[PDB]
Amino acid sequence: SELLVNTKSGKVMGTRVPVLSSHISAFLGIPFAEPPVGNMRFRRPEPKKPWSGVWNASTYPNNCQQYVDEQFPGFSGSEMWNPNREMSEDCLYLNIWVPSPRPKSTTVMVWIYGGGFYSGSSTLDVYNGKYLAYTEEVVLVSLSYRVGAFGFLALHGSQEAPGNVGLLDQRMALQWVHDNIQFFGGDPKTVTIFGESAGGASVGMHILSPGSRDLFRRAILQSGSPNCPWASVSVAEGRRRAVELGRNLNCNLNSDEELIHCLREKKPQELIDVEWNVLPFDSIFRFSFVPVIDGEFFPTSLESMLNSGNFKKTQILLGVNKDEGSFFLLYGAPGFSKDSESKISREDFMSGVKLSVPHANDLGLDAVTLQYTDWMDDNNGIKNRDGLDDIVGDHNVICPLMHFVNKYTKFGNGTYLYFFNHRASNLVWPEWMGVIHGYEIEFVFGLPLVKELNYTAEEEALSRRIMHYWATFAKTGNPNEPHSQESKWPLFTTKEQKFIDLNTEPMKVHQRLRVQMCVFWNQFLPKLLNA
Amino acid sequence: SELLVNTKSGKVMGTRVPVLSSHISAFLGIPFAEPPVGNMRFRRPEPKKPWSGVWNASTYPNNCQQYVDEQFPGFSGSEMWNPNREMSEDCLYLNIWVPSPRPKSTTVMVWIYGGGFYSGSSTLDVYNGKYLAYTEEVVLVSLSYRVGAFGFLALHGSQEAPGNVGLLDQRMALQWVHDNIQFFGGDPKTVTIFGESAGGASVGMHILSPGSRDLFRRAILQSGSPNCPWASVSVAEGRRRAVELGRNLNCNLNSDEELIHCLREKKPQELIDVEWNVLPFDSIFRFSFVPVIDGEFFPTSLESMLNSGNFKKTQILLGVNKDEGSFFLLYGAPGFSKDSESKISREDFMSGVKLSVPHANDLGLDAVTLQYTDWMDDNNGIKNRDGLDDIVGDHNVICPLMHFVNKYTKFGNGTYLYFFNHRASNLVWPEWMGVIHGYEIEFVFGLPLVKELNYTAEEEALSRRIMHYWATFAKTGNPNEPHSQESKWPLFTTKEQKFIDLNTEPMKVHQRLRVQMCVFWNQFLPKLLNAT
Ligand SMILES: C[n+]1c2c(c(N)c3ccc(Cl)cc31)CCCC2
Ligand SMILES: C[n+]1c2c(c(N)c3ccc(Cl)cc31)CCCC2
Ligand SMILES: C[n+]1c2c(c(N)c3ccc(Cl)cc31)CCCC2
Ligand SMILES: C[n+]1c2c(c(N)c3ccc(Cl)cc31)CCCC2
Ligand SMILES: C[n+]1c2c(c(N)c3ccc(Cl)cc31)CCCC2
Ligand SMILES: C[n+]1c2c(c(N)c3ccc(Cl)cc31)CCCC2
Ligand SMILES: CC(=O)N[C@@H]1[C@@H](O)[C@H](O)[C@@H](CO)O[C@H]1O
Ligand SMILES: *[C@@H]1O[C@H](CO)[C@@H](O)[C@H](O)[C@H]1NC(C)=O
Ligand SMILES: *[C@@H]1O[C@H](CO)[C@@H](O)[C@H](O)[C@H]1NC(C)=O
Ligand SMILES: *[C@@H]1O[C@H](CO)[C@@H](O)[C@H](O)[C@H]1NC(C)=O
Ligand SMILES: *[C@@H]1O[C@H](CO)[C@@H](O)[C@H](O)[C@H]1NC(C)=O
Ligand SMILES: *[C@@H]1O[C@H](CO)[C@@H](O)[C@H](O)[C@H]1NC(C)=O
Ligand SMILES: *[C@@H]1O[C@H](CO)[C@@H](O)[C@H](O)[C@H]1NC(C)=O
Ligand SMILES: [Cl-]
Ligand SMILES: [Cl-]
Ligand SMILES: [Cl-]
């Protein structure tokens, strides 16, 4: 009854799950797409054909085919992001958590996972939607989408591998929510899409894309924005990487049809094993198969759309973490280690700069170095380490997001900006990594409310505060409850540019988030590189 | 007898002058070259022909012909730099202060005035050598040299106006000191040349020039160095400016001989009246007629000479002041005023940046702006004013000097670096201008020892400290006295790069003077401009 829901494509049977001292309904693994397998690899998604009988939605679905991180075998800090279910190309499913008893027509939040567009799963423990749905009385959906070559191989002009199909997977899931969430007690007119990293870039890409705009009400972007340097490629570069993928597999490269035909005959792991080989440069924070600026999903360049106001005008809430870059340095840059303080020599700093800004000429590398080097103390290994951490985070996350924030706010209907800088008491990563990319997610999803995870009481309060900001924003377009006597999170405005710190201390309001470095990344360095 | 000295070109009679309750000998206005007048305008100097009888050396000579600053009529802060004697092209003279009684063979210090190579006088009150000569028992010489077009009009390939003749004037006075200072009790083997701004650049240029190197022992450079961006031009640019000077005066421009003949017919003020018109850019801290890189006084580019060690290897003492730029902004940049705090709007900041780095493209100007702008607080008029002050001082004085310091120290025999950051208690310029270009000179010359000038007792002690550093360095190559228990001024070395603050507080040693901004000015911005 409560668990048996008839959708437009057939009946589904959810499950009653415990949450804290109560219970909630979960509908796990609902298909929203035809399985993109066989001759439909690389193709746009097709709607899921109606089924007879009752879909058993009591268990999580398969995860999409992806690179699996084996750098630290058995280590929870890295394993927590790996697929926890079987990988399969048959992976286009979504999950729903519904308060019990079922609400009449409540706010909906739709989670879009990140993972550099090459990885990610809806089923991670850290994305368990039951705490947020229960605590804030929202209907919480997590979608899935094809990643890597399966989702973003781009041979522009081909209709068999057009590019951006992972973004179309997300859109088809949003269309499914639009058409079906009313049957689960959700209001399809009050859908907030939120996501982190590539998920936050994705959220911003749906804000830009005309074909997505009417499928949600407002948006939350965590540590990602659509203009991030890693988040898209040109049609020429997407084609070059697709052709190089075929070259790495001894494919016929004479035509798109023959290349695509060759690639469709490979096992999924064969593509994944050579995926990283197509990158143009040795780099960190760069990924092989990402959205393409195609003239269709994106009618024109992202910058021209931002400048002209060609995007959905609504409310957004968005922000960044203090140390976005540290995870990427640990994995890709010389001198960094999980098991040491990672003091960086001058020589390893220069190597990291080159890896961090791979597209830059020597003049640009000199500019980055001068901007982030204390020449009174240039052999200070801690300063070199933290400077490289800042370079990676500023270039790849913070300054792109600040560019987006400032462009969006000129036309939008309300911007709320945060700076998350709380290091969790129970972090398994070393202290030098600081406030890591993605480590606000466990607060957004309410993991500190679980006693067994051993967060502090102040971290539980911070989680409840963040969940309530997010859900109140989703419900109203404003994270603040007016008439309350809590500290108010102010609107980000073009003039005053206010943001808040998110941490366990009383709220602080600041202005012009990392303005000095972002003038460098957003105005001066592009001019230098263009010259 | 003590005042009656026979030199190689004739007898000179000095005068006994009072100094701080005592007396000293002064020989004022001794000629060291033939008057460079008439057909000798623009020509290399010629040695003074011997004279019969006794040259009256009791009064200061004429000053060389120059632009006179009338921005603030009657204001001592500007008038103290203007000529205080009649101007004449007949101006190649030197002055000598000799301790009394005359020493046997003591250290010589030869002052070379600054003034952007367009102005300056040996006779200014602030260059009065009697306090330094008396207090430190040195023979103090101040030379003179042609400035402006008269000293630096350059038509390379012409022997009638070859360029650099003002530098050759300085060299001829150094040659005169070499040949004659022994008759005044000075040791020609222990001559220190020192100078400020263009004078400091000049000192550095004699360090570089093979034809000057044997005419002095060691060198002091104050707020100037030979590689300063204002201190030299190429032969093509010198020729362009000389032709444009002729154009401004309706001269025949068909040949060097015709142009030079035209320019020699003009009265001196006619040249001066159009001198500034030949500059290629609206700018501050740029001067029309300056040394030329000619292949003769300078055998190759300054940078190649510095890189190869093709220069005099000796000891140097040098440094800069905290606020080198402020004087030049007051005179040339929008928003600045002697009578206000000169808070600078963002618009006037951007105008000032353009004036301060005239050779920069738009990307270069963006780079400078970004380096000196606090984008958390970009409408702060004090920060904008102080940022422009730093830009002008860093680009034109501090960072060129640090480039020289580092290149010289690789091959030299001892470097001592200072940072003068004391603002005089009786300064007549407003507070925003800070520790102004040239305002260490009064301490070097011992003016705080004169009670009527109303320096504090701490400033008198600072002046005595500085004079003793300067003269002890001149005597020994080391500003520190041996066996003394005062704090030691360390050698500047390539690795440690130590310098001292010069002020009324106990000496503090620091490292890497202005290192962050000078990486920008000395490495990044030149690379950017070269690449774009
Ligand atoms: C794969 N991964 C890792 C770390 C993260 N913080 C992540 C944050 C967001 C996302 Cl989407 C993926 C993340 C830490 C290091 C282990 C790998
Ligand atoms: C396996 N791999 C990875 C990353 C890379 N940048 C790579 C570049 C070249 C090659 Cl061959 C393999 C690469 C980023 C971190 C994820 C793994
Ligand atoms: C081959 N490789 C590379 C990079 C990585 N981060 C990698 C991470 C994991 C693994 Cl398994 C392989 C990796 C950085 C770019 C250089 C190659
Ligand atoms: C002409 N002049 C002036 C000021 C200075 N500090 C100077 C320092 C050195 C030299 Cl050479 C010339 C100087 C202050 C402003 C008045 C003009
Ligand atoms: C009198 N004058 C002029 C110009 C200048 N750049 C000057 C720079 C500094 C000083 Cl002190 C005086 C200057 C150009 C235009 C002609 C007049
Ligand atoms: C920079 N500047 C100055 C003075 C002038 N008379 C000028 C006349 C024209 C032009 Cl373009 C620039 C000028 C007087 C001395 C202060 C600087
Ligand atoms: C294993 C597999 O899927 N093979 C098919 C192949 O039979 C077909 O001819 C080709 C056309 O695109 O598409 C491939 O996907
Ligand atoms: C649905 O799947 C769950 C998990 O395996 C199982 O417990 C339940 O009995 C299934 N429902 C059916 C078969 O009707
Ligand atoms: C949002 O739009 C409404 C309706 O036009 C307007 O009244 C309101 O001022 C806007 N708010 C912001 C923050 O732009
Ligand atoms: C949480 O802390 C308690 C003691 O404070 C400890 O016994 C327990 O093992 C911790 N939990 C985990 C998962 O380690
Ligand atoms: C030298 O000149 C001064 C003033 O010009 C004069 O008083 C003095 O008598 C002169 N000496 C002579 C003429 O021997
Ligand atoms: C100066 O030269 C002497 C003699 O060659 C040498 O012994 C001494 O080390 C040098 N001093 C410096 C500071 O270079
Ligand atoms: C110096 O101080 C004395 C004593 O007060 C005063 O008479 C004199 O006018 C001052 N000098 C100047 C130039 O102000
Ligand atoms: Cl709080
Ligand atoms: Cl004449
Ligand atoms: Cl050394």
Residue numbers in the entry:
A (entry chain B): 4 to 534
B (entry chain A): 4 to 535
Reproduce, without paraphrasing, sentences from the article in which this PDB structure was first reported.
In the crystal structure of TcAChE complexed with the 6-chlorotacrine-based quinolinium derivative 5, we found three molecules of 5 bound to each of the two monomers present in the asymmetric unit. While the conjugated system of the molecule is sandwiched between Trp84 and Phe330, making a π-stacking interaction with Trp84, the orientation of the chlorine atom is quite unusual. In the TcAChE/5 complex, the chlorine atom faces the opposite side of the gorge, pointing towards the main-chain of residues 116–118. In this orientation, the nitrogen of the exocyclic amino group H-bonds to the carbonyl of catalytic His440 (2.73 Å), and the methyl group points towards the entrance of the gorge. The loss of the important interactions of the chlorine atom in the above-mentioned hydrophobic pocket is most probably at the origin of the 300-fold drop of potency when compared to 6-chlorotacrine. We decided, therefore, to model a second, minor, orientation in the active site of TcAChE. In this orientation, the nitrogen atom of the exocyclic amino group is H-bonded to water molecules, while the methyl group faces the main chain of catalytic Ser200 (2.74 Å). This close contact of the methyl group with the protein is probably the reason that this conformation is poorly populated. Other large electron density blobs in the mFo-DFc maps indicated the presence of a second copy of 5 at the PAS. 5 was modeled, making a π–π stacking with Trp279, but in two alternate conformations, with the Cl atom pointing either into or out of the gorge.
